Amino acid sequence: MSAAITEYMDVAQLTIWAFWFFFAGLIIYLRREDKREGYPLDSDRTERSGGRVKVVGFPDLAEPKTFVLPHNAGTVMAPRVEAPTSINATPVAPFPGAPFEPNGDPMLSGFGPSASPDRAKHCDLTFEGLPKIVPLRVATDFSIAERDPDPRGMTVVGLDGEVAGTVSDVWVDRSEPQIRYLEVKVAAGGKNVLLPIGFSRFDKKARKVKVAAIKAAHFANVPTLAKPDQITLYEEDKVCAYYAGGKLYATAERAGPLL
Amino acid sequence: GLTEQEAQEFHGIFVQSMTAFFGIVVIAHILAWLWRPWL
Amino acid sequence: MTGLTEEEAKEFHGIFTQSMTMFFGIVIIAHILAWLWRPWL
């Protein structure tokens, strides 16, 4: 054997071409894996064709893979058929690609940044089968680190600076110990609502929790929990999505543009 | 997940295909040997 | 199944061949012209 395959072809040239064929197959494989969610696409192409043309692009979809959930929570198929969901919005113009304007109060529309899918109405579970996100009042073995302030008792302040409530309890993740939610006693109504840690900016000196997402008045409409001591995956999405809607809807100037 | 009866049929065809593929291979190696022996 | 009716398959195949041979005929003429211009063999 030798390095020269022909007068021009050599082993290194063959090796690099061999990689291109493998890499092409790898990209096709990866794109097919990418398409296990959200495909076939929601398209006008399908709509005018009466559903006779499924928009998948290239490569086409893969055969459904099986996710067996722990604790007999069920089995999900990664490529799955999903029922169409109506949107609480209307197009701002009739051309394709035009955005939609939410209907009613945008913070309550469940559209745009306030939209969320309906997840399972079951709590995420620890390896031992207990609910994962729970208040500190039921996860008695958990505690706040000594060097960090206790969130409980802190004043919750909305985006406008007005006081929204106080922190009654802290919800922790029992698998990876960390704060995920802050239970707020709303100043107006008194009904407890959850506040995700991702929307909470701590002011350690002032003992204040600043929520730039929504105003103090918006806290009254935060989606509530069925059971007081646990939260389902469905409820988690509903709560987080509501605060996210405030990043665009809470104040009129947040819609933009800047100039 | 494949039962025994369809296993009996598969092996017969596979052996026939392997024997057919082997036979072409043997002729090609004979022709290659006549063209340019390597050993 | 591709969502097509069985009569659509007959009808598509006929038009597909007509367009394919028409394309092939232009190609053959092009190669005859190209061969007369500069033969490669």
Binding site: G38, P99, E101, P102, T126, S175, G256 | - | -
Partner: protein, 277 residues
Amino acid sequence: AMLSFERKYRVRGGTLIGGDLFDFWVGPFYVGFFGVAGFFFALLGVLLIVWGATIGPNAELQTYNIWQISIAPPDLSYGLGMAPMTEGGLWQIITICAIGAFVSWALREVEICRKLGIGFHIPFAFAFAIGAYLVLVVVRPILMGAWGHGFPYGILSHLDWVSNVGYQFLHFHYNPAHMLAITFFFTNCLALSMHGSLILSVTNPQKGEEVKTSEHENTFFRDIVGYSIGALAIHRLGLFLALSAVFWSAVCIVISGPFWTRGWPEWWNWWLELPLW
């Protein structure tokens, strides 16, 4: 066409500039003001590169070979002024278009982030890559005093630039910021393989097993290296490693020539000449 869950997210507003003028989608892409600006910045820059390839260094050497196409910066004698189009001026125009396209891409990402109500980590992270490019073609050439210090626009020609810039300091491996940046690049790749492996091995476990848990994830690397950073923190670490690699790479090149002209191994003479030894 949108994802089957996407329609409920295609909201009006959230633009930085333009309001409703360009607030629409073209196929999958969001356009906005900076989609229009970015696209035609890129389109012009791409066409000028093709035009730069059409005339080549000269008519004799002109090539459309994708490896060999090269739009070169001006000669150093042009300083920080503008050069004639066929003598590096085209490179200067393409660089401006590239900056326009890259920044518009980042700003379009900001508008998308506002629409979706997510953190601005992605455009912030992309700014580091833009900053590295700006260091290479703007900050460093200005510190050196000539636009000709920028790298040529060519798939292989800019490797010759990297090679020769490195050998302008006789052994570029000894650049301390370069060593730090490579360490971050190598660690990031290791962390990425680890994170990709752990997620895949947990959600695609052995046959006959259910999907594993976050407890399995922490246990696995505790069992291997005695520590688990956590599901959230690995993404902090991956972002930190990638951004630190680019930051230190930008530092390493901007000190190579503007703030250090000697061979890089000689820089370590401060340590060798410590009076302790």
